[PDB]
Amino acid sequence: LALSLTADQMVSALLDAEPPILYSEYDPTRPFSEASMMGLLTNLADRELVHMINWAKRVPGFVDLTSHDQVHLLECAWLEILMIGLVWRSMEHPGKLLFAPNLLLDRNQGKCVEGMVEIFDMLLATSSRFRMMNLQGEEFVCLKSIILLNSGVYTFSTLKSLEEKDHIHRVLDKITDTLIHLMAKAGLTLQQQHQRLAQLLLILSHIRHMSNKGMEHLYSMKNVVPSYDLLLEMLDA
Amino acid sequence: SLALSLTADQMVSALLDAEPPILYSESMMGLLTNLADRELVHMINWAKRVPGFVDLTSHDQVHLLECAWLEILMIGLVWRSMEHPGKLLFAPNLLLDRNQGMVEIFDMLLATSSRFRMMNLQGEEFVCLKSIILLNSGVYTFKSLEEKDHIHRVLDKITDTLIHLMAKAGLTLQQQHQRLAQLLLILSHIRHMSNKGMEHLYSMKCKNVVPSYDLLLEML
Ligand SMILES: COc1ccc(N(CC2CC2)S(=O)(=O)[C@@H]2C[C@@H]3O[C@H]2C(c2ccc(O)cc2)=C3c2ccc(O)cc2)cc1
């Protein structure tokens, strides 16, 4: 059904699929230690993951994939999705990261965990870049769906496999069409439309980078990462 | 900036003419390190000819190269291996396949090579993509505000260059932006491959081959 959506139907589907805003655990002891703060973020992240599978099942075209390739895309994308959501929540709070409405952290609180100030600096800079470009909500939900479909597609010798990759790349093309259509409705010229598209997609490489760093530093300290069976369990419900 | 007055055809001509030669190979990590060592010297001199790159302070040029150096090598590899399905053409005399492989990276590099082949990636588009990698990889990690604004204009020029090439080649508008999106989403997998390779380099204890900031400033 996904490839039959017009642009505006794609936007509506994605908007209505949006996950809820969750709160951090209430009145934790502050200030934080390294362990306690990581406990809070791990607890929030784990609760956001249930809602991210609900959201992914509603991304047009996702369900058409085999459960195996659904899990694979979520394994590859889950941190990038958590991170772009964090950056979007944080746009209107310059200098700060809004992990939850009750958990707004300034730069110097990232120092609690050993090398998580560097990722904080990267998330803040991305939020400024979104604020500069005046990223629109309809653009964000498109970008977040691109992350889900694109991040894992390149590491899927059966003929079945080529069919899903083509189906991926067809949905991605449709979300590209959708992004362009929103820009044209906004009133951007063709040249501005092309430049803004590239410039939203180029930011995705940095979000990949941040995600890879996040994992990397995490390890240099592991089991907290969600397992295949866990993602696959949650999917089957 | 004369970079910002360039037409699409001047931009391609500048990048095509700055293309480094394909070098030859002459322990498998030793061979690759020797090759990469020689590849680097050409990449600095190539980066200096990317339009709008020398208008950056030497501090910012180094930061971009430090961020982008392994993505640039990797995309070169993928481009050389594109007509050798199943194999990676590290050099005309060092063509390897999966068995010789670091199997994780190899399969990611091969999948990237197959994607470029599936899309019929053109050499004019190739050079455009490497320039983007160089200018985009470290711009978010950065006087500072004039610098970033300059880099985003040059990036807009390369976008215009890519779109112009497609328009010539006969693609419709819808095919043009779809084309542009597919090329740019591949860059995000190249960044991922660079990160994997980078942590792997350190995992195998060879964290000395990563050119440092000072080394790049010196070569520059
Ligand atoms: C035996 O163990 C291994 C562990 C890893 C690998 N890797 C990829 C495996 C092949 C699929 S890799 O990602 O670490 C790294 C990127 C690419 O392959 C390596 C390499 C390089 C870079 C600088 C060095 O000083 C030395 C090696 C690469 C490279 C060099 C030149 C070039 O033009 C293009 C790419 C290989 C062997």
Side-chain angles (χ1 to χ4, degrees), chain A residues 2-15 17-20 22-24 26 28-91 93-105 107-112 115-117 119-158 161-162 164-165 167-184 186-215 217-220 223-228 230-232 234-237, chain B residues 3-25 27-33 35-97 99 101 105 107-117 119-139 141-142 145 147-174 176-201 206 209-214 217-220:
Chain A
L3 308 172
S4 57
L5 273 41
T6 67
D8 291 333
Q9 275 157 348
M10 177 71 68
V11 185
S12 305
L14 300 177
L15 279 176
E18 268 294 272
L22 306 186
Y23 286 87
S24 190
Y26 174 83
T29 304
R30 295 186 186 181
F32 318 97
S33 60
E34 166 176 279
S36 82
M37 198 196 63
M38 274 297 300
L40 283 171
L41 302 174
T42 298
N43 176 264
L44 177 67
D46 296 358
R47 286 182 287 115
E48 279 185 283
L49 293 169
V50 186
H51 299 279
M52 191 207 303
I53 294 88
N54 296 337
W55 163 81
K57 281 270 172 213
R58 298 185 236 181
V59 163
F62 194 71
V63 67
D64 303 331
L65 316 169
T66 80
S67 72
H68 175 76
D69 288 342
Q70 290 180 34
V71 177
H72 179 246
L73 295 180
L74 286 151
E75 286 185 318
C76 291
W78 71 271
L79 184 48
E80 274 178 287
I81 296 168
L82 287 186
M83 277 182 174
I84 192 177
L86 172 69
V87 160
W88 172 251
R89 293 198 295 279
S90 299
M91 277 172 66
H93 303 269
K96 289 174 172 283
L97 297 180
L98 189 59
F99 287 93
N102 56 338
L103 191 62
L104 179 75
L105 306 175
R107 162 175 203 256
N108 282 17
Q109 321 195 57
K111 282 158 208 213
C112 276
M116 294 180 64
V117 61
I119 300 92
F120 273 43
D121 278 333
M122 290 204 273
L123 294 154
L124 292 172
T126 308
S127 198
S128 311
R129 186 65 190 131
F130 282 179
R131 200 169 45 248
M132 275 165 225
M133 308 184 66
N134 182 36
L135 183 67
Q136 312 279 86
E138 292 91 1
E139 293 174 317
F140 157 83
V141 301
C142 289
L143 277 185
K144 181 170 68 167
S145 293
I146 289 180
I147 292 168
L148 173 73
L149 306 177
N150 179 70
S151 290
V153 71
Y154 308 99
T155 69
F156 291 114
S157 178
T158 185
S161 68
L162 295 179
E164 292 210 305
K165 287 166 67 180
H167 177 91
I168 296 296
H169 289 114
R170 291 217 56 211
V171 186
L172 283 175
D173 272 358
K174 176 62 91 183
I175 302 172
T176 301
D177 299 341
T178 307
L179 276 177
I180 292 309
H181 176 72
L182 300 159
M183 278 171 215
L188 298 180
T189 74
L190 193 71
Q191 187 188 0
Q192 300 171 303
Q193 287 172 45
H194 289 338
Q195 295 172 356
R196 184 173 180 88
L197 190 68
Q199 187 189 141
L200 291 183
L201 299 185
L202 285 180
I203 282 169
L204 273 47
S205 70
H206 186 49
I207 286 173
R208 197 62 157 279
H209 185 56
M210 290 201 291
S211 175
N212 294 142
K213 306 316 259 165
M215 281 324 175
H217 291 203
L218 171 242
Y219 270 96
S220 314
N223 272 1
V224 169
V225 172
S227 85
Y228 182 104
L230 181 42
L231 296 167
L232 185 39
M234 263 174 270
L235 284 160
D236 283 325
Chain B
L4 297 180
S5 67
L6 292 194
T7 57
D9 300 356
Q10 286 183 321
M11 172 83 63
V12 65
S13 288
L15 308 175
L16 283 173
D17 288 1
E19 273 292 288
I22 297 168
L23 312 181
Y24 272 79
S25 173
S27 187
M28 192 159 294
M29 196 55 68
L31 293 186
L32 298 195
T33 300
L35 170 62
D37 274 6
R38 288 176 283 123
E39 289 185 293
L40 278 300
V41 185
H42 288 268
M43 168 196 314
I44 296 93
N45 291 276
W46 158 84
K48 272 142 75 146
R49 304 170 64 180
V50 176
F53 186 80
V54 288
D55 303 325
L56 293 170
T57 61
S58 279
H59 162 81
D60 291 334
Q61 297 188 23
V62 170
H63 181 67
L64 289 188
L65 287 161
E66 204 183 356
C67 287
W69 75 268
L70 188 60
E71 295 177 80
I72 289 158
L73 291 183
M74 291 192 138
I75 191 172
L77 176 59
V78 166
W79 170 252
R80 304 191 293 270
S81 305
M82 199 188 150
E83 305 287 71
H84 302 260
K87 310 206 172 293
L88 301 177
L89 199 151
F90 286 89
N93 64 341
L94 186 49
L95 195 3
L96 299 156
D97 61 283
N99 320 313
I105 309 290
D107 281 287
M108 287 190 285
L109 291 166
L110 283 166
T112 312
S113 180
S114 299
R115 180 63 178 156
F116 286 168
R117 206 201 308 121
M119 316 178 43
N120 303 325
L121 182 76
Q122 298 294 304
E124 300 74 17
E125 294 169 321
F126 171 66
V127 295
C128 279
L129 288 181
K130 301 210 292 314
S131 297
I132 291 167
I133 287 179
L134 172 72
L135 304 169
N136 190 64
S137 292
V139 70
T141 301
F142 284 141
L145 281 297
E147 287 293 70
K148 280 192 284 169
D149 179 78
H150 181 61
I151 291 180
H152 281 301
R153 279 167 86 201
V154 190
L155 281 168
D156 286 5
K157 295 295 286 166
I158 301 162
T159 297
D160 296 338
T161 305
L162 277 169
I163 293 281
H164 179 251
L165 301 165
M166 308 179 193
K168 180 177 172 57
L171 286 68
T172 61
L173 279 70
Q174 205 177 227
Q176 285 168 43
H177 55 74
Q178 290 183 347
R179 184 70 180 191
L180 176 74
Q182 306 159 343
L183 299 172
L184 291 186
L185 296 172
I186 298 170
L187 298 187
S188 195
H189 179 237
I190 294 168
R191 172 79 68 117
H192 174 64
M193 284 187 291
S194 171
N195 285 317
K196 292 289 286 183
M198 209 57 99
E199 62 173 330
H200 280 81
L201 278 296
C206 291
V209 188
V210 179
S212 77
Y213 180 101
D214 286 322
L217 182 59
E218 299 285 89
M219 294 181 72
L220 208 65

